[PDB]
Subunit: 448 residues, 2 copies
């Protein structure tokens, strides 16, 4: 939700951002909000005018109580004021709603460090890491995406895609999943199941060590926490609702982690609050027609360990940088070459004020694909969920700043590992880091 | 689903089984089915009769095409024959419907060793294990449920309930979950989260050691896999359905584990198929008014590692005994005293022919509670999901038997570990076998 004060104090700043985001259809709202914000405040002025009047008309009837007291009239102007007052109050109540309706539907204001853009072809690579194994036939595309800024090694043989690797490794059954649940669902098997749990614990351990309290939240939540975590557009695009219940399947532990302190007032001394959640994630993937069919990259369900941070507005950005790094450290340990990216305004999304994505090099696809996403939501969620805080019990509670970020979303990490650590015969070597969790050190294909 | 050949050949057998089950109402069905099945078979006869007659009446009009062809009378019959065939064909369709309607609702035929009873009170203990810690105040109930066939020691102090323990340990927040999702939901924290994942892994490890194929299945399935795994009653009572989609939230890794081979003909050579799934579980818990409020025992979501077995009809019973014991083995290493009970007709359920439950002694609650259940479904599920097998490509395919059993349902396992390994100060000692997974050996109280 946007801050009424902001629209009042700089409509041009907002209007321009709405345009950087490509949401022209809404710039016309800025004016309509003030239009209403204005009627709202004059009607207030009137009510007070009115309240003061009744006081005056009150003492006046008293003065006449001693006189001829022809107060039949005054007692009528009174009944009028009270008639008016309520009507106004109601009229005002109506304006606040129309105003709020629009405020809840406006994207967070972007930070000036956000590059201006149209789509994802305008995001901006700002850091690289690792030695990318590149197939001869990808050389140019790789170099365009790496900006020559990434170290690599050429491969004569062609790397296989994760979907194939899974099959030769006996790691999954797609056919049957489709029979049982439809498309974009899967049955994970053997080593791959351990690997999955393996990545969860790993992610868990690290964030805990860095002082995050581990939490397993409810997988189903009440509509308001979804309305307070993303835009109302997600209700059609991604969230599943269960029949006859005010219950929605969470698409990320982020949401329940945020609704955790809805309607509270935190004690500034506890801040920052550091949570690392684990939960299955459910997403409709309605907008995707056929961009990633069969496989476990763009699916309806998956596991993800998530970082959630409650901070004071002055430490948020410093934190935003901290979490994305926490995320980076994990993949480095997984020996997964990648590139962090600063997402532009057009592809930024309603909630984030600034977003950092870690796209991993995929030796098979010959391109970088999102693997983690770190966002600073400033006060957008707070303002919605009414999450405020105070330093001294004396006065005014201020809204806190919330930040979220993937640690490891298992499905997409497994792809990364599979494509990045494969060998000519299909064998996949597990990063040494994960040995204590997996047991095995590699996954050989069936037929040996 | 019951085999209609069973109802034809041995009506009395099923009526009598129904009676033991105390489903006096459904006993009526056996006669109804037989009746309708007869009308069905007969009308099926007459149809072929006519189909054949039509042919004969067809050639006959052709023979008269050369003769005086007084086929006006012989022609009016061909029109009634077909009119009749069509009437029957439709009558038959409507009968199969009425018939399958019952065949899909009859409970599975119970095995003779199933003790006759009415409710959970007529269930029979058959083994005990462990030394229980009993509060002096719970002495009577404890001897009642143990029949004094179990070792033990009296406690002068009163063991706390898990809900309390969870709070003094800082491992869960229920207030906030109720805010975010409602009652019977929760947030797990700190050492409790790791313990939850450690139980999953520990059960998965020991089951893989024993030859089970580990699998993560789809958490949402189509209606057919649900109607195939349970009785239709569970749709209102236990299963959540997702709005506008033919998808249902799974209450156990068992269902997708059974759907997995729906409409197949397995190669006998491969029997038995041993799967051990892991997954979140969702249950409406609609029938429970206020039997276990606040806590994590009766809840809407929990994690559970399940054993599923596709078996040859003649080895299913050997397997029903193998899995219940597999589970025992786990709780024993887990140092949890318990008793295993054999469920009676009344509290049996619709899909099982026999069923053992392991009830863990709960020191604080003062009673034995269910932590795992194991059933042999024989051919009830297989007949519904159309899961068959053959040894020789020559021969008719036979229905396989299916079975399932809990390995560990984290939620309940955690209350047992809590209430059973609690010391007087409230700290909880993690059993030794779980050390390689948790790192920590105990959970000491938060200071507040």
């Amino acid at each position: 939700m946007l801050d009424i004060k902001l629209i009042r104090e700089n409509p041009e700043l907002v209007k321009n951002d709405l345009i950087k985001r490509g949401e022209l259809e809404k710039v016309k709202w800025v004016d309509e909000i003030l239009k209403l914000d204005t009627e709202w405040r004059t009607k207030l002025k009137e009510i007070n005018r009115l309240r003061h009047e009744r006081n005056k008309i009150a003492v006046e009837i008293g003065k006449r109580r001693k006189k001829g007291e022809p107060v039949d009239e005054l007692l009528a102007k009174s009944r009028e004021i009270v008639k008016r007052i309520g009507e106004l109050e109601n009229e005002v109540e109506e304006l606040k709603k129309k105003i709020d309706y629009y405020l809840w539907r406006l994207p967070n204001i972007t930070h000036p460090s956000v590059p201006v853009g149209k789509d994802e072809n305008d995001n901006v690579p700002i850091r690289f890491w690792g030695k990318a194994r590149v197939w001869k036939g990808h050389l140019e595309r790789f170099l365009e995406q790496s900006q020559g800024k990434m170290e690599y090694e050429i491969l004569e043989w062609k790397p296989k895609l994760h979907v194939d690797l899974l099959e030769i490794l006996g790691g999954a059954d797609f056919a049957r999943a489709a029979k049982v649940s439809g498309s974009r669902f899967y049955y994970l098997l053997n080593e791959i199941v351990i690997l999955d749990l393996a990545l969860i614990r790993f992610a868990l351990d690290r964030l805990i060590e860095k002082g995050f309290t581990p939490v397993i939240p409810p997988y189903m939540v009440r509509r308001f926490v979804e309305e307070g975590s993303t835009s109302f557009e997600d209700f059609e695009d991604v969230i599943y609702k269960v029949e006859d219940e005010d219950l929605y399947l969470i698409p990320t532990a982020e949401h329940p982690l945020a609704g955790m302190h809805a309607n509270e007032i935190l004690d500034g001394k506890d801040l920052p609050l550091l949570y690392v959640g684990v939960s299955p994630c459910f997403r409709k993937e309605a907008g995707t027609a056929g961009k990633d069919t069969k496989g476990i990259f763009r699916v309806h369900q998956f596991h993800k360990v998530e970082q959630f941070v409650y901070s004071r507005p002055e430490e948020s950005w410093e934190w935003h940088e901290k979490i994305i790094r926490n995320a980076e450290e994990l993949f480095q340990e997984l020996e997964i070459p990648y590139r962090v990216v600063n997402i532009c305004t057009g592809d930024l999304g309603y909630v984030a004020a600034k977003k950092y994505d870690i796209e991993a090099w995929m030796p098979g696809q010959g391109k970088f694909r999102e693997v983690v996403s770190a966002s600073n939501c400033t006060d957008w969620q707070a303002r919605r969920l009414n999450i405020r805080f105070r330093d001294r019990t004396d006065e005014k509670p201020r809204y806190v700043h919330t930040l979220n970020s993937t640690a490891i979303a298992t499905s997409r990490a497994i792809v990364a590992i599979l494509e990045n650590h494969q060998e000519e015969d299909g064998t996949v070597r597990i990063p040494k880091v994960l040995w204590k969790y997996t047991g095995f050190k590699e996954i050989v294909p069936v037929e040996k």
